[PDB]
Design a binder for these strands. Structure first.
Ligand code: ZN
Ligand code: ZN
Lengths: 814, 115, 62
RNA sequence: CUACGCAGUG
RNA sequence: UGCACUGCGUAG
């Protein structure tokens, strides 16, 4: 039968299942089960859980037991195993010591350690000078890293004498530096990890070192009390008056960071106001049982509850549609989009979803190789730092955030700060960390689901600084055509056809897939967000130094990753994830999507047997992938180039910030050479801590039909000017709901309706070529309603109700 | 320019008002106790806030956390001063009970002072 | 159809209720919002009519 | 090209 | 009452 083995030799290499006192199952089996998870085949995981009293068989009778969102209690079950894992780690260290004492040089593999922690392998061990033994633990520890956080192995470290039974350790409330504790934990657990570990990322040599140190800090921080982390503040004298001002920050990932320009003007006033130190100090203590998140303070005497008003209904358009034969009984086209009202507890409830963000430790070698590969997808673009006068702001009448929203909009602050002041603030952010407060606001929009949606309005200072830092690269990406990232590419004037042709480019046996990210903005691991930030900042090689880039990363983390959240007059500490109001929201998520795809491909290739592979080139590629993953430190540029070319040839991706359309080879995916939907599910399981349902994922066998859905648009192949082209059309229900229901009564009727219905007709024209007659009739209904509105209002306006104007919008002339 | 001066004045006034709302008796204690002088922000309200506000979603959390007129939280004793509902009405202690729980506009906001 | 116009009637009833300062009372607003959301998401006509009748009774009470 | 307003997408 | 992209309408 099949057991998981991590093998390396000339003939074959990889971590996969093979046909080949001691316990029935080994640690490699557990790692494989938790890293290659398929609900259809969970026999090994179920037997391991049952045998060691993690849970009972009845637990598996319940459906969706594996899902974290549907069944969070699973997190408890896995935790029941964590202690065992911890023990194994300790034993591993002992084993290593013995080898060092015995002058033994060898490689330790997960498949040679039983679940009781005992090591039963004495092969590949070569005698050397006593005291000179140097074991290799890269593969073992790297593969075991993801399991440690999922099972919460180090929980015992939070108890006195590292015993779960005995009480918790009562750390000093004022203590914030745990550097010695981090060193002690690393020495006890990862003693033989030869790579240097820096608890404080301020002393990291490069971006890869920062990723390594942050990965270790993620695991080490779970032990320390939550109150210790956060902004560090001091009481100082300014102008003969006392002020409490932030002078540092404690990051769960980056350790302790101290501002370099601490001392005891408009720039200073904004720095103080944006700082949550004063607000928290002047705020009353708060205990909110409505959420599991940390509560800091309350700035208001009374709590505030916000409600979502119901949508307005347009009787003229609904009556017109009814008279023309729509909304009948049994009709295919129906109203499924509405404005869903919410109670006063909705907003906070939405914040509660941040509970799905969990401390996740990534496979550091895998993450390093994946980031190196991902950097290739962003090589064409150019980036750097720009001055204040080179910054473009689309809208100056937007909210400036808290507390800046009280006094005015973003225009007020942009006008108040001169270019020199903005440059001074940016330079200050290159030397110091400025914590900020982000407000949570309910968004009023159409949806087909009753769930409320929240957006994070960040402070003005963070937006300004991130703009000056990133706008060059962001504009470079948006102006590029034919790349994997398709931000800035219009679907009109043949853009959809161009993108689809680009995706299909040179695939031997093409099929299409598309997947979804459950709770993407909330459940995203902090490590992946840091990796995306580093990828975006890697364009600053010349214009910024190592210290400047690190301080910019720290500012982003303190303003995006674990900032202070303002909700209904109360302050909370965001566990993690990504804010939707960031200057780099779309692009960071695109980087995350590319990283997940590359990780899935890497897992698929290594999980293959290798011996069965009948292609010499693919076997050599797998062997070199394992070499560059678990055996070689320095980045191999040649192999990175080769793997990027391989992925581009057999894995063509079109990514827009959450949505991915992938063209992949039939035979390679069937043989496991290329990632499939199951690989993405496993990756999202052991990395993103979320279960991906096959219902939300789609696979298209035939290219002529096109992608099932992309950006809420479906695709049709239609005949235009003797040439067949791909044309995007929306769901008729969405357009009809937009027409019938409106945000406010101001846009209920009048001239302003003409523009709205013209835009809706522009969007809905492609439905005319759909085989269904009602879909086509939707566009004619919209045109006739535009005619009727013009008549009620009463030559150029003719073009609005003549279909040639909408014909022109989808032709490749422009 | 004039609006810039207005914003500067508003920010200064807000900071000084928060200072008036700030008390140094315990802040100086914690500052002097700390060797480095740096303290986490989150702990400042915990050990220095005179007033505590607790949000109660249901009666079960009510009995669990602050059932009586005096309760213990954050290693401190808090005595209740007021209990309002979601509608900002003065709910009395007697009214809070299992029998009358359905008639209360949850969540309940309870405000207490440090003992 | 009766389902679509029932949904539209529920939407307008919730709008007028909100304009009647019903949102001042937390529990009444919660009940009205729940009823309206269920009506919009309802797939059975009879349940939609029952919920619309309940919401109309809420309005008629005041 | 710029100012304002609107619609769609994540 | 957030960050971006795209397309329209009105003045220059
Ligand atoms: Zn480092
Ligand atoms: Zn730079």
């Amino acid at each position: 039968v099949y057991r998981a083995f991590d093998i390396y030799n000339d003939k074959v290499a990889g971590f996969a299942k093979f046909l080949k006192r001691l316990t029935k199952y080994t640690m490699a089996d557990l790692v494989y089960a938790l890293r290659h998870f398929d609900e259809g085949n969970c026999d090994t995981l179920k037997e391991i859980l049952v045998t060691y009293n993690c849970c009972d068989d009845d637990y598996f009778n319940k459906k969706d037991w594996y899902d974290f969102v549907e069944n969070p209690d699973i997190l408890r079950v896995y935790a029941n195993l964590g202690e065992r894992v911890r023990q194994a780690l300790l034993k591993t260290v002992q084993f290593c010591d013995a080898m060092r004492n015995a002058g033994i040089v060898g490689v330790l593999t997960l498949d040679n350690q039983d679940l009781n922690g005992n090591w039963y392998d004495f092969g590949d061990f070569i005698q050397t000078t006593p005291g000179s033994g140097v074991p290799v633990v890269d593969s073992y520890y790297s593969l075991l890293m993801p399991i440690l956080t999922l099972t919460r192995a180090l929980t015992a470290e939070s108890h006195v004498d590292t015993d779960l039974t005995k009480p918790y350790i009562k750390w000093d409330l004022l203590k914030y530096d745990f550097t010695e504790e981090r060193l002690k934990l690393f020495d006890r657990y990862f003693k033989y990890w030869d790579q240097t570990y820096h608890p404080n990322c301020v002393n990291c040599l490069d971006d890869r070192c920062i990723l390594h140190c942050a990965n270790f800090n993620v695991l080490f921080s779970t032990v320390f009390p939550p109150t210790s982390f956060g902004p560090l503040v001091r009481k100082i004298f300014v102008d003969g008056v006392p002020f409490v001002v932030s002078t540092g920050y404690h990051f769960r990932e980056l350790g302790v960071v101290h501002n370099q320009d601490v001392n005891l003007s408009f720039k200073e006033l904004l720095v103080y106001a944006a700082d949550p130190a004063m607000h928290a100090a002047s705020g009353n203590l708060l205990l909110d049982k409505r959420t599991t998140c940390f509560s800091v303070a309350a700035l208001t005497n009374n709590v505030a509850f916000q409600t979502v008003k119901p949508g307005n209904f347009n009787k003229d358009f609904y009556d017109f549609a009814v008279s023309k034969g729509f909304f009948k009984e049994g009709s295919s086209v129906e109203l499924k989009h509405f404005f869903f009202a919410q109670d006063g507890n909705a907003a906070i409830s939405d914040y509660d979803y941040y509970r799905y963000n969990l401390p996740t430790m990534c496979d550091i070698r895998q993450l390093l190789f994946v980031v190196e590969v991902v950097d290739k997808y962003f090589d064409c673009y150019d980036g750097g730092c720009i001055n204040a006068n080179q910054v473009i702001v689309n809208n100056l009448d937007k909210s400036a955030g808290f507390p800046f929203n009280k006094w005015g909009k973003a225009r007020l602050y942009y006008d108040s700060m001169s270019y020199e002041d903005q440059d001074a603030l940016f330079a200050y952010t290159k030397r110091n960390v400025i914590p900020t407060i982000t407000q949570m606001n309910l968004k009023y929009a159409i949806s087909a689901k009753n769930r409320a949606r929240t957006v994070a309005g960040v402070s003005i200072c963070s937006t300004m600084t991130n703009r000056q830092f990133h706008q060059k690269l962001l504009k470079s990406i948006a102006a590029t055509r034919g790349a994997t990232v398709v931000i800035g590419t219009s679907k009109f004037y043949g853009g959809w056809h161009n993108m689809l042709k680009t995706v299909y480019s040179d695939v031997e046996n093409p099929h299409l897939m598309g997947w979804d990210y459950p709770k993407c903005d909330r459940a995203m691991p902090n490590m992946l967000r840091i990796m995306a930030s580093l990828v975006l900042a890697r364009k600053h090689t010349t214009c910024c130094s190592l210290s400047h880039r690190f301080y910019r990363l720290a500012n982003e983390c303190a303003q995006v990753l674990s900032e202070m959240v303002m909700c209904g007059g109360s302050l909370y500490v965001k566990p993690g994830g990504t804010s939707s109001g960031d200057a780099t929201t779309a692009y960071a998520n695109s980087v995350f999507n590319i990283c997940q795809a590359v990780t899935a491909n890497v897992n698929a290739l290594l999980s293959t047997d290798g011996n069965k592979i009948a292609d010499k080139y693919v076997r050599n590629l797998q062997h070199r992938l394992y070499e560059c993953l678990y055996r070689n430190r320095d980045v191999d540029t040649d192999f990175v180039n080769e793997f990027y070319a391989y992925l581009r040839k057999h894995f063509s991706m079109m990514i827009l910030s959450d949505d991915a359309v992938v063209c992949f080879n039939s035979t390679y995916a069937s043989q496991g050479l290329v990632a499939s939907i199951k690989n993405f599910k496993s990756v999202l399981y052991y990395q993103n801590n979320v279960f991906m349902s096959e219902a939300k994922c789609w696979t298209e066998t035939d290219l002529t039909k096109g992608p099932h859905e992309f950006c809420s648009q479906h695709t049709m192949l239609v005949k235009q000017g003797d040439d067949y082209v791909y044309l995007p059309y929306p769901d008729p229900s969405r357009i009809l709901g937009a027409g019938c229901f409106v945000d406010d009564i101001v846009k209920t009727d009048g001239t302003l309706m003409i523009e709205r219905f013209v835009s809706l007709a522009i969007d809905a024209y492609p439905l005319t070529k759909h085989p269904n007659q009602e879909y086509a009739d939707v566009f004619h209904l919209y045109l006739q309603y535009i005619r009727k509105l013009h008549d009620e209002l009463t030559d150029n306006t003719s073009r609005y109700w003549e279909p040639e104007f909408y014909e022109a919008m989808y032709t490749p002339h422009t | 320019e004039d609006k810039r001066a207005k914003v500067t004045s508003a920010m200064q006034t807000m900071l000084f008002t928060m200072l008036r709302k700030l008390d140094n008796d315990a802040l100086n204690n914690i500052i002097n106790n700390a060797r480095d002088g740096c303290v986490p922000l989150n702990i400042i309200p915990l050990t220095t806030a005179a007033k505590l506000m607790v949000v109660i979603p249901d009666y079960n959390t009510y009995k669990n956390t602050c059932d009586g007129t005096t309760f213990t939280y954050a290693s401190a004793l808090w005595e209740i001063q007021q209990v309002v509902d979601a509608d900002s009405k003065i709910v009395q202690l007697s009214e809070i009970s299992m029998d009358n729980s359905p008639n209360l506009a949850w969540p309940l906001i309870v405000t207490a002072l440090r003992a | 159809s009766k389902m679509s116009d029932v949904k539209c009637t529920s939407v307008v009833l919730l709008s007028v209720l909100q304009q009647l300062r019903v949102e001042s009372s937390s529990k009444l607003w919660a009940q009205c919002v729940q009823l309206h959301n269920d009506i919009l998401l309802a797939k059975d006509t009879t349940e939609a009519f029952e919920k619309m009748v309940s919401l109309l009774s809420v309005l008629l009470s005041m």
